[PDB]
Every structure is written in structure tokens, then in C-alpha cells.
């Protein structure tokens, strides 16, 4: 859902990109640091 014009819980209630976003999306697996964990809020 972290891409232009997307749909789903994130892109409709949390983090929405324009239908003509200019830039790049970069991501990595972080199970090595971020999992234990229930701090990560969303709607």
C-alpha cells in the first residue's frame, strides 16, 4: 500500500500517496530490531 493511488487500511486511514507522487519508496525487513511488540499504532 506504500505506493501512489493505493487502497487498503493504510492508504485509506493512515498513509496516502497522491495519484501522481514524484519520488521513491524504499523498505527493508526489520524483524532484527522491531519485534518483541505492540507499540505500532494504526487506524
Amino acid at each position: 500500500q506504500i505506493a501512489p493511488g493505493q487502497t487498503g487500511k493504510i492508504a485509506d486511514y493512515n498513509y496516502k500517496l497522491p495519484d501522481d507522487f514524484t519520488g521513491c519508496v524504499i523498505a527493508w525487513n526489520s524483524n532484527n530490531l522491531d519485534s518483541k511488540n505492540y507499540n505500532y499504532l494504526y487506524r
Binding site: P4, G5, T7, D19
Partner: protein
Amino acid sequence: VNQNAQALNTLVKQLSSNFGAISSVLNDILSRLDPPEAEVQIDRLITGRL
């Protein structure tokens, strides 16, 4: 009078044509699809209509 009236009818009838879009009606495309898709379906209808 006939040729002018045939050109007017042919221009209006071309609104009901698809041009490679999913409907010749504009509100169909606007309601049944999301903007990333609907704005391609209307690039079809515009590049036909124009």
C-alpha cells in the same frame, strides 16, 4: 441541409462509442472504478472524443 444534419447526428452518436474504454457513459467510469484506473479509462474516452 442533409449533410449538415448527418454530421450533427454522427458527432452525437460518437458519444455512445467505447474507443477501448469499459463504458461510453462517463459516470459509470467515475463510480465503478478508482482514480488510478478511471483516469486511464477517461484518457481513452478523451483521446477518442477529441
